[PDB]
Amino acid sequence: SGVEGAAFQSRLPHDRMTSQEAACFPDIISGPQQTQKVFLFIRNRTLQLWLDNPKIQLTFEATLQQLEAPYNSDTVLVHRVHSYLERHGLINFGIYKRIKPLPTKKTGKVIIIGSGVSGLAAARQLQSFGMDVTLLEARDRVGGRVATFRKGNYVADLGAMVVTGLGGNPMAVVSKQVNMELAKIKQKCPLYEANGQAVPKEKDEMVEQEFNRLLEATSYLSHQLDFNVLNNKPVSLGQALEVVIQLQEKHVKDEQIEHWKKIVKTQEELKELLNKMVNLKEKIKELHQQYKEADITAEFLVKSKHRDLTALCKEYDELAETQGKLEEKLQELEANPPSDVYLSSRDRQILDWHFANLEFANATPLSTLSLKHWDQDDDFEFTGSHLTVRNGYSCVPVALAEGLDIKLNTAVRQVRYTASGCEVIAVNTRSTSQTFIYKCDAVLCTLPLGVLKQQPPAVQFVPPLPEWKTSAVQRMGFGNLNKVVLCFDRVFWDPSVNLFGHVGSTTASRGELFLFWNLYKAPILLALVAGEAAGIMENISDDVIVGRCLAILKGIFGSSAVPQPKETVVSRWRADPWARGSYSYVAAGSSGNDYDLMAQPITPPIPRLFFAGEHTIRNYPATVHGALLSGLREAGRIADQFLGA
Ligand SMILES: [C]C1=C([C])[C]=C2C(=[C]1)N([C][C]([O])[C]([O])[C]([O])[C]OP([O])(=O)OP([O])(=O)O[C][C]1O[C](N3[C]=NC4=C3N=[C]N=C4[N])[C]([O])[C]1[O])C1=NC(=O)[N]C(=O)C1=N2[C]([C][C]=O)C1=C(O[C]C2=C(F)N=[C][C]=[C]2)C(F)=[C]C(F)=[C]1
């Protein structure tokens, strides 16, 4: 439905109030049910008005004007709802034409550290709320972990690049505002072994289904059997995976043993039976000779000896009858061995490709993920197909930058906060002699977790952060993932597939150049470096890593089909001092609760230091939309503090 759709698109239950809304509207929850239903219609319809046309600001007046009777009659309640939705960034977020021009007098000075998606989102909110906002950004560009390369006709994203489903996704609004060219991804993904041979369909499917089985089993171990702590250590996903593979191998070796035991027993029965038939032939040779050695006692001796001979012959025919039903049991046993091994060497390499794919998705070796909690955010996935940004994801943060006071090449080195306000100190990256001191009422830190983890610290906090916050920083995972961009003058791959796989030869190197994407109009290929390989590969020069790409591609399509690339680019997210990795993951011994701790502001009294970024939002970590939502959350929190809730 339409207004139900608006609630769903806002990640809200269309038919009940959230706890957050109960807090802000306690008179509604305690009042009659009828008024609660009126509240919900006001909320849903306001969201619908905004979502149907997010390119312009939705004002209170226009909300009142577009409500049908009787709802356009309860003006006070309508205003209460509009104000709440706006303050929480559920309407009038992103980039839109203002109806009310910006207030000329500001209220409060906010420094935003970082011009990534979270910092930009907060800046636009706070600027809309009438505050003085300045962004300090260490790079020479906006977007942070959204990073688009452009050269000639080539466009390619080195950081984020996928919009997951639009249903419920706030990026669906931003897409409409910015004109992102999104394109659905085709799901077919052929695999090629390290020799360039295609993985046959049956092997592709067999190994994939086993991957699904093993993984569901780790989840059963974790959430049914509570196998989460061992020898005082938290179990990792990698650890659980090794255990379930060990049990399959044990099972194969057992059925093999059971089968050899059946073989041996049948051989032993045949050995004995043949020995027994031997002795019955010997007995018949003896009677057949005493049958030729032969009166009334003789006429009766032949009758009796024929009776004896043909009875031993009937004994012998019944034993050769058992002899046949046994050596046919033997024949069919020798023809149906169970599997010699659980995974053939090739099967194992392909399976390591699926593990690598998972290390891509989580940006970290499987041996680091918390078994119990690595996918705690699964329940919040958006609906609809995933898409890629054909015109480059930088289109989003560049649009978010319009009108913001952004000082680029301004690297924060120290953050001071007291009960009287804050000071941020920064240097010019083109001249680290030049120093700047920014006083403000509040600091919003969107520094990546990797930068916060840096020892010795890149940015120093004064006073130092509390233990409950720093140990949360320490506990959380911060992964890595890299891309190689290959620009050619001709397309030699299958244009109708967006993905294809290179199966690495070893477990340790399973993440090396394992997945290739063709996602664009122009002849571009991205090859991913995941897992253990990601950090190690940063130490390889560009030309050499491209060469290894080219060798893989020449193996698959033929050496003469692969020309020299016209342009190449290589990400090194771990070595990037403004990233120090790609995005958080739930490390073994952490949990969603650490993401909640990260969002918590510090108070030295009133809060001064605030936190946003993908690492602060429990239900949507490690994503652009989660960063965005986190910026919206902190903008609401800061405005509630400094302008009143
Ligand atoms: C890195 C990365 C990559 C490579 C990729 C990706 C990613 C990443 N992701 C994530 C995102 O990006 C995040 O979440 C965001 O970004 C967040 O944000 P924030 O928070 O805001 O942060 P930043 O940006 O960084 O910002 C901050 C700032 O700050 C600054 N600084 C520093 N230092 C300093 C400063 N300033 C001053 N001072 C000082 N000292 C910096 O510089 C900055 O600026 C993502 N996401 C999403 O959503 N999407 C996507 O797409 C992504 N990605 C990925 C990963 C995983 O796997 C993903 C995916 O995949 C896709 C693909 C690719 F990528 N490639 C190829 C193919 C495909 C998917 F699918 C999904 C997802 F979810 C993810």
UniProtKB/Swiss-Prot annotation:
It comes from Homo sapiens (Human). Residues 3-102 form the SWIRM domain. Changing K325R: Loss of polyubiquitination. The lineage of its organism: Eukaryota, Metazoa, Chordata, Craniata, Vertebrata. Its EC number is 1.14.99.66. Changing S118P: In AIMAH3; uncertain significance. The modification N6-acetyllysine is found at K261, K262, K265. Induction: Down-regulated during neural differentiation in neuroblastoma cancer. This is Lysine-specific histone demethylase 1A. It is found in: Nucleus; Chromosome.
